Each structure stands twice: as structure tokens, then as C-alpha cells.
Design a protein around this ligand. Structure first.
Ligand code: URA
Ligand code: URA
Ligand code: MG
Ligand code: MG
Lengths: 289, 289
């Protein structure tokens, strides 16, 4: 299963400059650097993805680690064996830029049988803080499994279907881990952290506590268990380009109780490190380690 | 002219935790730290905003500089006199999170007569690469001066009107600078860098070169001179909250010729530093320096 691009113009170009990743087909040997990539792990925070790469290095059995995108502060990239770790910033536009350049990179490198997993934090709906949610379906603010984007003057809608067997395999992996609360459920992706997630603590708020609670309860009823900001564009682009995608997010709070993240530093760090424990278990099982 | 929030729930909270800025009303004395802020300058790149703060420090007459948000890799913040320099990442969601927390911060600090200027890069339409565009009107992909966002289950539309006299004053400032190509024109804000700006070099492309050229020419006809990814949410939030906003972007290429940014390193650095020259001139004139 090869990673493929869906653009007939790429083939016509003499060189491909991955401007935001500060990489290129002329300046770099992409099949030699990335041809053996089988696992791509993406998160927002560059410090957290650096820590994930260092963690995976030890989990793969090996005994500081160079940013392949050291030339740019937009994104960071680390590679340990068949595992690629990439930061993507916050929001649908920031991850979309990364995904466009990454899908082109994996296709130039002729990668195949690639699993890509978004790891991060989210807000929970009716679930205990620190719960790990494996997304089965990524939905928009209207609880619809679709990704809408504007291309020129037109709105184009794409499917956000995530690989079902991969979400089942990640859940089966999670059961072996002690003190690891895990759940398979829908994930709602929004464009705004504050008004877009029904928060009452933003600079702007025109709705009531009752209106936000009714909204969150309807989301729970539609099967939504967590809220984040990258899942729909991630699921839509990866599925379409030959990548088996998954979303594994830890919850930092239950939105049916509050909007402000107020956790002790050591609890926040523990929760933040829960998705990487599952991915490590999953990669180690896939590689026979 | 005080910076104001538009949320009756903020007043009811005992403390306000600015989670992404790693600041708070309980942990910090916000009126003492930021009460004298009169100029806020925002850009995507943390390295570029660090360099801007160091540059402004010397331009204000003073003879390394501490990140006020050093505790988080999401955003960076530097202060030199009445000038606040903040990174905001890429895209409408990343800058929206920053703007929500920043408007709350400036309001807790009781700031007044605050000018906020987005400085950055963009793609040009029918203008020479390296041209500085001062936005008069920020428009969406449909060339409409509006900012649409999803709040709970509803779409809410806001005005993207930028301060006219401030754009005229920045243009008058730009005329004194030698070898500084400058223009006042509309700026189109998109959610996607590739398909969203009519690029033919993304991972996905379902349209033709002719369709993208027709689109860009219609944008030029509607008064659009540059394309970037943060202007509409920036103009919509700031205007509504008592901030006099402006957008000053340098163009890296003319989109009527190409999609890939291919510039010599020293030309890219020169172009990147053109918006900060104008802001320095503007702040120095405002302060009588
Ligand atoms: O509530 C939350 C917490 C983390 N990320 C989100 O998008 N929402
Ligand atoms: O073409 C460009 C260049 C910089 N930023 C953009 O949004 N578009
Ligand atoms: Mg880097
Ligand atoms: Mg910081």
C-alpha cells in the first residue's frame, strides 16, 4: 500500500521544494532518508514530539537527537528506525501545511504500508480527565463525519473515515497497560478553542452556560467523547493518500464541568505522556519487540 | 480607548488562567506588567518575533531578551518599553487562541489606546516579489470582507474592517524609506496554503492551471493584492475589542507566475525584514523618536 499524491502537476515539476519543512527533491535524497518509514507520529508541541522521539528511541531497544527540519522553527522532525516524529502546531491550517508536504515527502521516498497516528490532548465530554480516547470517527462542530474546505471559489467536502481495524488494534493494545483509562469514541474537531468549543472563558462569548451545556450533551448523544482541533483534516487527507490513520488523544478536563485547564504540573505531565505509552506498545507489537 | 472583552462570564471568575500563554491573574500582576503597552506586534515565526523585539529594543534607543511565555513552546512574548512582540503560529485557529488570551490579558492590565499590527509574509498577485502590502480590507476566499466562524451549532459572521486612518498613516510612513516598495490593497485570508490558495504543487490538486489563473485574476479584479492565512480573524477580533489593527505583509513571490517559494537566502532574509522597518518608523514617529 503505497503513499500516493492526488495531483497530476507534481510529476511535471523538475524539483519539489518543501518550503515549510525546509526539505527538497534536489537538496535531499528522500528515498534514502525516508524509504524505510512505517510509522509517523504527529503532535502539536515541538518539545513534546522531541520527548516522544527520545522515548521511542529507548522503546525500540536503542541505548541530543537532531531535528531533520532544524532550519525552520515552523515544524520539527525526528527519526528513530522506522518511526518518524513530527510537530504540526495548532489548528487545521497548521497541520494541513505539514500533511501536504509530508504526503509529498513519503511519496517521493516511495514509502509503503505507512501508519500515521496523531497523538495529543483534548477536552473530554462526560469522561474522567486523563482518559485516552482512540477516535473511531472524526466529526465537525455539527457532529457530521466530513471535512469541508474552500478550494478557489468552491466548497469541497471530504470523508473523515479513520481505519476501523487500526482503532480496534490500538484499543486491544491499551487493555494490557495498567492504570491506563481508554475508550473508543467520536472526536469533534473545531476551528476555535474558545467560542468554537462552547467555552465561557474566552475574550468573546455571546451564548449562555445553558446553551453550551445543551450543545455538549447533544454532542455526547451523537457519540462525541472528546474535542480537539486537527482530527478531521488529518483523517480526510491521510485516508485519501494511502496512509492508515489513527487519533489517540488524552483528555485534560471534562467539559460538562469546566472550560479552564487547571491541573497540578505532575498530573498534566502524566496525562500528556499517556498517548505515547499506547503508541510505543502498538509499534513494539507491530515490530515483534 | 480601552481594550474590552465581550463576555459577561469573565467578571464572575475568581481567576483567569491564560493556558496557552502560561500566564494568569493569580500568578501574575498583569496591570503592572502590561499596563503601559501601546503597541502589539504579531507574527507567525517565534525566531522572527525574537529578532523583531531585539531590533525594536535598539530602535527605541536602548543599548539575551527573556520570553515572558518561556514556559510554553506554543507562543513566545517579548516586551521592550511600550512594545509587545508575540508569535502566533500558522493559520486562523492558532492566531485566534493567542488573540483570545491576549485581548483578556490587555483588558486585565486595563490597557488603552493600543495599536496592534500583524507583520509577516504573503503571496503576491500581480505585484513584484518583496512588495510590502498594507491591508486596507481583509477578505475571505470569496473576496468578501467577512469572518465566518462556527459557534456551537451556528455560523456567526463578523466584520473584518481595519482602521482606515492607521493604514493611511503606515503608507505615509513607508514613503520616507528608500528602496521600500509599498502598496495599500486588499488581502485574502485562506484556511489552506495549497488547495486553498490555488497552488498546483500540493499533495492534492483537482483543478487546472487555467482555473487557478482565472481565480487569481478575479481576485486581482476584486482589489486583492496579497494572500496570507491570519488577516480576517485578526481584523474581526481586534476591531470588536477596542484595538486599532493593521496588517503589513511582504510578498515572497507573484502567484500569477508560480506556487513554489524559490528565493536566494539573503533575498528571503531582506524581504522578511521589510515589515519590521515600516513598524519601527511608525512606532518611532508615534513616540516622537
Ligand atoms: O479542551 C481542550 C483541551 C485541549 N485541546 C482542545 O482542543 N480542547
Ligand atoms: O504564498 C504565500 C506565501 C506566504 N504565506 C502565504 O499564505 N501564502
Ligand atoms: Mg525545526
Ligand atoms: Mg514560549
Amino acid at each position: 500500500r503505497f503513499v500516493h499524491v492526488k495531483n497530476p502537476y507534481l510529476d511535471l515539476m523538475d524539483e519539489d521544494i518543501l518550503y515549510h519543512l525546509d526539505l527538497g527533491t534536489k537538496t535531499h535524497n528522500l528515498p534514502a532518508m525516508f524509504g524505510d518509514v512505517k510509522f509517523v507520529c504527529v503532535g502539536g508541541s515541538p518539545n513534546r514530539m522531541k520527548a516522544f522521539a527520545l522515548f521511542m528511541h529507548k522503546e525500540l531497544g536503542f541505548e541530543d537527537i537532531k531535528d531533520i527540519c532544524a532550519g525552520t522553527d515552523r515544524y520539527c522532525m525526528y527519526k528513530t528506525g522506522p518511526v518518524l516524529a513530527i510537530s504540526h502546531g495548532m489548528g487545521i491550517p497548521s497541520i494541513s501545511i505539514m500533511l501536504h508536504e509530508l504526503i509529498k515527502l513519503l511519496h517521493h521516498a516511495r514509502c509503503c504500508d505507512v501508519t500515521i497516528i496523531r497523538i495529543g490532548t483534548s477536552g473530554g465530554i462526560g469522561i474522567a480527565p486523563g482518559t485516552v480516547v482512540i477516535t473511531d470517527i472524526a466529526v465537525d462542530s455539527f457532529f457530521k463525519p466530513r471535512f469541508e474546505q474552500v478550494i478557489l471559489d468552491n466548497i469541497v467536502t471530504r470523508s473523515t473515515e479513520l481505519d476501523k481495524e487500526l482503532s480496534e488494534e490500538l484499543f486491544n493494545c491499551s487493555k494490557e497497560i495498567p492504570n491506563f483509562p481508554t475508550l473508543v469514541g467520536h472526536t469533534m474537531c473545531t476551528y476555535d478553542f474558545y467560542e468554537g468549543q462552547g467555552r465561557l472563558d474566552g475574550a468573546l462569548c455571546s451564548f449562555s452556560r445553558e446553551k453550551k451545556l445543551d450543545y455538549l450533551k447533544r454532542a455526547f448523544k451523537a457519540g462525541v467523547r472528546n474535542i480537539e482541533m486537527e482530527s478531521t483534516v488529518f483523517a480526510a487527507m491521510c485516508g485519501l493518500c494511502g496512509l492508515k490513520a489513527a487519533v489517540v488523544c488524552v483528555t485534560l478536563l471534562d467539559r460538562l464541568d469546566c472550560d479552564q485547564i487547571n491541573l497540578p504540573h505532575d498530573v498534566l505531565v502524566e496525562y500528556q505522556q499517556r498517548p505515547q505509552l499506547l503508541i510505543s506498545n502498538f509499534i513494539r507489537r507491530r515490530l515483534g519487540l
